[PDB]
Write a protein that binds this ligand. Structure first.
Ligand SMILES: [Zn+2]
Length: 242
């Protein structure tokens, strides 16, 4: 039920990159979309050399507020998909045990669910094994289950176009069968246009010779050679509870 979709993105870019066309298609179909990003917290200059290195790679200068730049990128992108944005308080791995973080994230996701009253929640399956993706996913599974909201896990992009598939779920959980969500040409066009806004991240992901848009078209194509642009998600089955 796509009437009210709440997508939980680990970082500023992940939702658009992975489910952007399905989100666009939901909005075109008359549904309501909100993307909440967990790791969208504030940090102004001055930064650590380790952060300066990541910033320099995004094309940012020492005095520029990076998380602000990225929050602005996220707003521009989501606006093009007709999706609402909500920015979470957590700091990217790069400006900073596991249980305390998951529990903190879960509380905020519960607060977001109560506020947005969604009929469907989405988050990443955490292909690529980023610890922020694992934390976001795990917290979202707990929060959506507590609030009895249906949930799907998406195939992280572009990461899935290069490698893996097998994600390591919490105990007692496994993935249901994968489902391809097909979209029309305008939803795909809107996705790719929205992706251009995350210029900071695309300076790596669509760096010289990265095939990003081609790679994404090819990936979608591999999954359904005859039937246009598509994105993969899975339902979650709980075979065992504590
Ligand atoms: Zn990410």
């Amino acid at each position: 039920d796509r009437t009210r979709i709440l997508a939980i993105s680990p970082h500023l870019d992940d939702a658009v990159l992975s489910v952007g066309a399905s989100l666009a298609q939901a909005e075109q179909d008359g549904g309501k979309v909100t993307v909440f990003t967990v790791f969208a917290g504030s940090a102004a200059p001055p930064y650590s050399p380790a952060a300066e290195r990541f910033h320099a790679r995004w094309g940012l200068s020492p005095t520029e507020d990076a998380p602000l730049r990225r929050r602005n990128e996220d707003i521009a992108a989501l606006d093009q998909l007709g999706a609402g944005h909500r920015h979470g308080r957590f700091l990217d791995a790069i400006y900073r045990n596991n249980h305390d973080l998951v529990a903190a994230i879960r509380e905020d996701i519960e607060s977001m669910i109560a506020e947005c009253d969604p009929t469907l929640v989405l988050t990443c399956v955490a292909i690529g094994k980023h610890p922020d993706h694992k934390a976001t996913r795990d917290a979202t599974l707990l929060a959506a289950r507590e609030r009895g909201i249906p949930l799907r896990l998406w195939q992280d992009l572009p990461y899935a176009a290069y490698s893996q598939d097998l994600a390591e779920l919490p105990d007692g959980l496994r993935l249901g069968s994968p489902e391809l969500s097909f979209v029309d040409e305008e939803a795909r066009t809107r996705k790719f246009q929205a992706m251009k806004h995350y210029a900071t991240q695309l300076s790596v992901l669509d760096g010289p010779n990265k095939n990003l848009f081609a790679k994404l078209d090819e990936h979608a194509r591999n999954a359904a050679p005859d039937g246009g642009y598509n994105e993969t998600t899975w339902p979650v089955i709980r075979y065992a509870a504590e």
